[PDB]
Structures are given as C-alpha cells and as structure tokens.
Amino acid sequence: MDETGKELVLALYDYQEKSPREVTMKKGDILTLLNSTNKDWWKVEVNDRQGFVPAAYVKKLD
Numbered sequence: 349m350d351e352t353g354k355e356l357v358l359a360l361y362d363y364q365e366k367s368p369r370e371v372t373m374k375k376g377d378i379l380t381l382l383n384s385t386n387k388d389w390w391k392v393e394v395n396d397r398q399g400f401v402p403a404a405y406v407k408k409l410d
Contacts, residue, residue: 349391355381356410357390363405371401378410 359373371392373379382398383391389400 350382353384357406358409360407361405369399371399
C-alpha cells in the first residue's frame with residue numbers, strides 16, 4: 349500500500365511485538381515506512397512482514 353508514504357526510521361527500542369499487525373525491530377535497525385499517518389503506530393514493512401511500528405520507540409535517522 350504505502351500511499352505516498354515513503355520514509356525511513358531507526359529502531360529506538362528493541363521491540364519483539366506479538367501481533368501480526370506489528371513490526372518487530374531491533375534497537376539499531378532500519379525499517380521501511382508504509383503509512384506514517386498514525387503517530388501512535390507507524391505501519392512499516394520488514395522481512396516480508398509489514399504491520400505497525402511504535403513511533404515513540406523509533407528515530408528518523410536516514
């Protein structure tokens with residue numbers, strides 16, 4: 349989907365997630381933003397596994 353929502357961010361906190369709509373990230377990793385519309389949760393795609401990434405637990409370093 350994406351929807352004119354291109355961007356990159358860095359894992360600020362090691363998140364393991366649990367739900368299918370979540371995105372597991374490791375403190376110090378890069379992910380591909382998809383939505384970026386919901387501050388609370390920024391939909392992203394990682395390892396053929398897109399879902400929702402925590403903004404607060406991230407850092408735009410790209």
